[PDB]
Design an enzyme around this catalytic site. Structure first.
Site, PDB file in Angstrom:
ATOM      1  N   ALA B  20      30.836  43.350  48.425  1.00  0.00           N
ATOM      2  CA  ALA B  20      32.062  43.286  49.221  1.00  0.00           C
ATOM      3  C   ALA B  20      32.944  42.079  48.843  1.00  0.00           C
ATOM      4  CB  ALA B  20      31.759  43.235  50.750  1.00  0.00           C
ATOM      5  N   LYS B  44      36.635  45.527  51.150  1.00  0.00           N
ATOM      6  CA  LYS B  44      36.777  44.102  51.471  1.00  0.00           C
ATOM      7  C   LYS B  44      36.510  43.874  52.937  1.00  0.00           C
ATOM      8  CE  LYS B  44      37.995  39.834  51.694  1.00  0.00           C
ATOM      9  NZ  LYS B  44      37.181  38.821  50.967  1.00  0.00           N
ATOM     10  N   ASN B  68      34.147  30.389  45.473  1.00  0.00           N
ATOM     11  CA  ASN B  68      35.302  31.013  46.149  1.00  0.00           C
ATOM     12  C   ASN B  68      35.424  30.510  47.564  1.00  0.00           C
ATOM     13  OD1 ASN B  68      35.100  33.292  48.470  1.00  0.00           O
ATOM     14  ND2 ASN B  68      33.321  33.405  47.072  1.00  0.00           N
ATOM     15  N   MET B  70      37.969  32.296  49.589  1.00  0.00           N
ATOM     16  CA  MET B  70      39.128  33.182  49.707  1.00  0.00           C
ATOM     17  C   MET B  70      39.805  33.080  51.107  1.00  0.00           C
ATOM     18  SD  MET B  70      38.908  34.462  46.668  1.00  0.00           S
ATOM     19  CE  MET B  70      40.194  35.650  46.659  1.00  0.00           C
ATOM     20  N   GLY B  71      38.973  33.015  52.126  1.00  0.00           N
ATOM     21  CA  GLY B  71      39.418  32.886  53.536  1.00  0.00           C
ATOM     22  C   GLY B  71      39.701  34.240  54.170  1.00  0.00           C
ATOM     23  N   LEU B  72      38.989  35.254  53.723  1.00  0.00           N
ATOM     24  CA  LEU B  72      39.016  36.617  54.326  1.00  0.00           C
ATOM     25  C   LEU B  72      40.441  37.207  54.247  1.00  0.00           C
ATOM     26  CD1 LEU B  72      37.320  38.669  55.825  1.00  0.00           C
ATOM     27  CD2 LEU B  72      37.194  37.081  57.809  1.00  0.00           C
ATOM     28  N   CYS B 131      30.123  35.138  56.312  1.00  0.00           N
ATOM     29  CA  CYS B 131      31.289  34.459  55.679  1.00  0.00           C
ATOM     30  C   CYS B 131      31.188  32.922  55.769  1.00  0.00           C
ATOM     31  CB  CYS B 131      32.555  34.930  56.331  1.00  0.00           C
ATOM     32  SG  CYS B 131      33.943  34.088  55.476  1.00  0.00           S
ATOM     33  N   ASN B 133      33.486  30.686  54.506  1.00  0.00           N
ATOM     34  CA  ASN B 133      34.783  30.076  54.056  1.00  0.00           C
ATOM     35  C   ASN B 133      35.941  30.001  55.041  1.00  0.00           C
ATOM     36  OD1 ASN B 133      33.780  29.614  51.508  1.00  0.00           O
ATOM     37  ND2 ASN B 133      34.189  31.762  50.945  1.00  0.00           N
ATOM     38  N   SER B 196      27.314  34.740  49.450  1.00  0.00           N
ATOM     39  CA  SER B 196      27.384  33.580  48.587  1.00  0.00           C
ATOM     40  C   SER B 196      26.594  32.415  49.165  1.00  0.00           C
ATOM     41  CB  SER B 196      28.918  33.286  48.265  1.00  0.00           C
ATOM     42  OG  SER B 196      29.527  32.957  49.465  1.00  0.00           O
ATOM     43  N   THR B 273      30.357  38.569  41.258  1.00  0.00           N
ATOM     44  CA  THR B 273      30.925  37.716  40.232  1.00  0.00           C
ATOM     45  C   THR B 273      30.999  38.466  38.910  1.00  0.00           C
ATOM     46  OG1 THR B 273      30.111  35.659  41.290  1.00  0.00           O
ATOM     47  CG2 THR B 273      30.580  35.512  38.940  1.00  0.00           C
TER      48      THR B 273
HETATM   49  C1  LIG Z   1      36.129  36.611  45.316  1.00  0.00           C
HETATM   50  C2  LIG Z   1      34.994  36.931  46.289  1.00  0.00           C
HETATM   51  C3  LIG Z   1      35.192  37.558  47.510  1.00  0.00           C
HETATM   52  C4  LIG Z   1      34.177  37.899  48.357  1.00  0.00           C
HETATM   53  N1  LIG Z   1      34.459  38.458  49.547  1.00  0.00           N
HETATM   54  C5  LIG Z   1      33.447  38.915  50.342  1.00  0.00           C
HETATM   55  C6  LIG Z   1      33.697  39.695  51.516  1.00  0.00           C
HETATM   56  O1  LIG Z   1      34.879  40.094  51.821  1.00  0.00           O
HETATM   57  N2  LIG Z   1      32.623  40.038  52.211  1.00  0.00           N
HETATM   58  C7  LIG Z   1      31.352  39.783  51.873  1.00  0.00           C
HETATM   59  O2  LIG Z   1      30.433  40.225  52.620  1.00  0.00           O
HETATM   60  N3  LIG Z   1      31.057  39.048  50.794  1.00  0.00           N
HETATM   61  C8  LIG Z   1      32.063  38.616  50.011  1.00  0.00           C
HETATM   62  N4  LIG Z   1      31.777  37.921  48.848  1.00  0.00           N
HETATM   63  C9  LIG Z   1      30.365  37.729  48.530  1.00  0.00           C
HETATM   64  C10 LIG Z   1      29.892  38.756  47.576  1.00  0.00           C
HETATM   65  O3  LIG Z   1      29.856  40.005  48.242  1.00  0.00           O
HETATM   66  C11 LIG Z   1      28.493  38.494  47.196  1.00  0.00           C
HETATM   67  O4  LIG Z   1      27.644  38.473  48.347  1.00  0.00           O
HETATM   68  C12 LIG Z   1      28.323  37.177  46.409  1.00  0.00           C
HETATM   69  O5  LIG Z   1      29.426  36.931  45.576  1.00  0.00           O
HETATM   70  C13 LIG Z   1      27.032  37.048  45.607  1.00  0.00           C
HETATM   71  O6  LIG Z   1      26.904  38.042  44.602  1.00  0.00           O
HETATM   72  P1  LIG Z   1      27.242  37.653  43.042  1.00  0.00           P
HETATM   73  O7  LIG Z   1      26.245  36.657  42.611  1.00  0.00           O
HETATM   74  O8  LIG Z   1      27.093  38.996  42.359  1.00  0.00           O
HETATM   75  O9  LIG Z   1      28.672  37.178  43.015  1.00  0.00           O
HETATM   76  C14 LIG Z   1      32.785  37.594  47.972  1.00  0.00           C
HETATM   77  C15 LIG Z   1      32.554  37.011  46.761  1.00  0.00           C
HETATM   78  C16 LIG Z   1      33.615  36.664  45.920  1.00  0.00           C
HETATM   79  C17 LIG Z   1      33.300  36.079  44.586  1.00  0.00           C
HETATM   80  O1  LIG Z   2      36.183  34.027  51.651  1.00  0.00           O
HETATM   81  C1  LIG Z   2      35.924  35.315  51.665  1.00  0.00           C
HETATM   82  O2  LIG Z   2      36.810  36.043  51.992  1.00  0.00           O
HETATM   83  C2  LIG Z   2      34.557  35.659  51.510  1.00  0.00           C
HETATM   84  N1  LIG Z   2      33.872  35.043  50.485  1.00  0.00           N
HETATM   85  C3  LIG Z   2      32.531  35.091  50.395  1.00  0.00           C
HETATM   86  O3  LIG Z   2      31.867  34.552  49.486  1.00  0.00           O
HETATM   87  N2  LIG Z   2      31.833  35.767  51.420  1.00  0.00           N
HETATM   88  C4  LIG Z   2      32.471  36.393  52.497  1.00  0.00           C
HETATM   89  O4  LIG Z   2      31.722  36.944  53.294  1.00  0.00           O
HETATM   90  C5  LIG Z   2      33.872  36.318  52.576  1.00  0.00           C
HETATM   91 CL1  LIG Z   2      34.714  37.216  53.913  1.00  0.00          CL
END
Ligand SMILES: Cc1cc2nc3c(=O)[nH]c(=O)nc-3n(C[C@H](O)[C@H](O)[C@H](O)COP(=O)(O)O)c2cc1C
Ligand SMILES: O=C(O)c1[nH]c(=O)[nH]c(=O)c1Cl
Ligand SMILES: Cc1cc2nc3c(=O)[nH]c(=O)nc-3n(C[C@H](O)[C@H](O)[C@H](O)COP(=O)(O)O)c2cc1C
Ligand SMILES: O=C(O)c1[nH]c(=O)[nH]c(=O)c1Cl
Lengths: 313, 313
Positions: B20, B44, B68, B70-72, B131, B133, B196, B273
């Site tokens: 996500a 998302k 990251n 991002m701040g949702l 989350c 962030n 993350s 990632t």
């Molecule tokens: C740019 C970005 C945005 C993300 N946004 C969300 C999010 O909206 N909701 C969520 O549950 N996790 C979010 N994550 C976390 C990822 O879903 C994931 O749990 C995390 O990046 C670890 O997996 P990876 O090692 O494959 O990146 C985000 C990660 C990144 C890099």
């Molecule tokens: O900052 C994000 O939007 C984001 N980034 C992440 O790494 N995990 C999340 O659950 C979310 Cl919602």
């Protein structure tokens, strides 16, 4: 150009030392770290009685870092106290002694005996509140009430400046709360950030097996895996404990990594996994490499850049 | 040999999906993920109202992973619900919708409106409890009382099977408590491990600066940094939640990385990632690679090895 530091009423040739647990369990290991180019050394975390630790294999290393569940193997407090009192050559460099009792009571019993030696010789206490590898014993510093009790009892029993080895945190509220706990205790003069990233799990694809025997393969992570976690906790505590020193530990393999730690707020820089893998020659390399970076940037001393990491906007 | 599987009363072509937040914010993104060879997609994480998120730069990637804050940022729940109700082609693959309200009340409001679309279309809810962030809003699942309240209120309001996106934990007592909370809720049918690794800090040596703007540079870590932590959590929850599914996320760049997640217990495997960096072509490569590892080992099915990581004695 100069790597010297003066802190805690001691003088250091440079900021580098081993991380607790690495190259510091035997008299041989301690003489070796003393003979190296490190600025200081720390002894293996000790318990009142000797411990064999966990079954082998209990440490393994890879390109990106290490996993360990050593189980606090050590020669016992009596030995490390004797090393500090009778054997260590303080003319070479300062000595830290890491204590890691399995209860508050065991820590208090140890620090009571350490105190006269700290007074006489100037050995420095690092109190380990973060071991992640002894079954049935979560990290003390992840229970903030337990942490406070340990620090109250140790402060009272020891009565001298000491430092604490902290686990990594991953939540701003945890930084806020832990630093606030620490700031209740004026005798805590330094904060070492970080212990291993707890309870990771490395799996070998070919054998389909975990790579360490204890705890079904779960163990603390060090090395390249943990550098941004380490820098985050260094900086979090640097910002939150303006009256304390922060020592950095985690992911140091180069002078550049040390430079990052220092920018984040580190005073001393500890070296675990990379020292385990490379041996004590790493310290001359790290010195040369940090000096090089400083020369290129026009920095003449560590205090010109310590804690001066820039934020955006 | 085909990688197809059945889970949650849906059929999937392969166990791969986006993580996500990655390639899933806009209609364009979701159409692209649908067009890819992934076995499923997740939207998302959304809030009741649209959000612009934190200031830029807010994502940065490096050879060992990403940071990251991002701040949702998202288009708002109404958009994602309309996508699920009207736009998604369910004949292509299953859809998960991720909700991340900033209060229990906000989440309840969303799931009450999702429920009829889940009944009609079969969209699956992933409740984000992790989350790291949004300033002032620490990770829900690091407060077990709060996690329990969220899960009671959502289960009551929603009334249908759902899943939960968990933060990484690093302490065996935390695994035990978190899994016991999850096990109180029979509607929680899947657990995604991990979000993350929260609040790391990347610093650029040349500029002496943090690399993202929000929160003084602090953000969640993904990628190679986090694979052993992700594996630990997947296995911890796989061990402790024997009547639920575990979806793996963290550190997947190859078929071999997916093979390890599945060995640890993963049913679906999410890609963050690496997907952000490589694009959606990554899914054909991961599938080819996982099939090749299976063939070389004589595995015909995923079930033959899921959760079958070996321990030592
Ligand atoms: C740019 C970005 C945005 C993300 N946004 C969300 C999010 O909206 N909701 C969520 O549950 N996790 C979010 N994550 C976390 C990822 O879903 C994931 O749990 C995390 O990046 C670890 O997996 P990876 O090692 O494959 O990146 C985000 C990660 C990144 C890099
Ligand atoms: O900052 C994000 O939007 C984001 N980034 C992440 O790494 N995990 C999340 O659950 C979310 Cl919602
Ligand atoms: C073999 C081994 C033993 C360790 N033993 C201890 C110890 O006795 N006390 C302690 O505080 N930390 C111990 N640690 C943690 C290290 O001091 C250090 O905090 C951690 O490895 C992260 O630093 P690194 O990334 O340089 O390895 C140990 C680490 C390793 C790899
Ligand atoms: O298992 C160890 O001995 C050990 N290993 C670690 O990674 N940190 C500690 O604090 C200890 Cl005490």
């Amino acid at each position: 150009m100069c790597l010297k530091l003066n802190l805690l009423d001691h003088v250091f040739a440079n900021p580098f030392m081993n991380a607790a647990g690495v190259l510091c369990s035997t008299e041989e290991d301690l003489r070796c770290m003393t003979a190296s180019s490190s600025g200081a050394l720390v002894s293996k975390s000790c318990t009142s009685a000797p411990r064999d630790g966990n079954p082998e294999p209990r440490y393994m290393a890879f390109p990106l870092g290490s996993i360990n569940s050593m189980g606090l193997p050590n020669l016992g407090f009596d030995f490390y106290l004797k090393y500090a009192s009778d054997l260590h050559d303080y003319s070479k460099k300062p000595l830290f002694l890491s204590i890691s009792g399995l209860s508050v009571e065991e820590n208090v019993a140890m620090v009571r005996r350490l105190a006269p030696v700290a007074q006489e010789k100037g050995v420095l206490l690092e109190l380990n509140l973060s071991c992640p590898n002894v079954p049935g014993k979560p990290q003390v510093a992840y229970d903030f009430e337990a942490m406070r009790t340990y620090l109250q009892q140790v402060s009272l029993a020891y009565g001298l400046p000491f430092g604490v080895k902290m686990p990594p945190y991953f939540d701003i509220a945890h930084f806020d709360t832990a630093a606030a706990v620490l700031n209740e205790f004026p005798l805590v003069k330094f904060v070492t950030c970080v212990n291993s990233v707890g309870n990771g799990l490395v799996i070998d694809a070919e054998s389909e097996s975990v790579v360490i025997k204890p705890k079904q393969g779960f163990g603390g992570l060090g090395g390249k895996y943990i550098l941004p976690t380490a820098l985050a906790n260094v900086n979090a505590f640097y910002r939150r404990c303006p009256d304390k020193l922060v020592f950095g530990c985690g992911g140091v393999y180069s002078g550049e990594d040390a430079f990052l730690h220092i920018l984040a707020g580190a005073s001393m820089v500890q070296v675990g996994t990379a020292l385990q893998e490379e041996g004590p020659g790493i310290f001359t390399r790290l010195e040369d490499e940090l000096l090089e970076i400083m020369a290129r940037k026009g920095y003449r001393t560590l205090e010109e850049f310590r804690g001066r990491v820039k934020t955006i906007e």
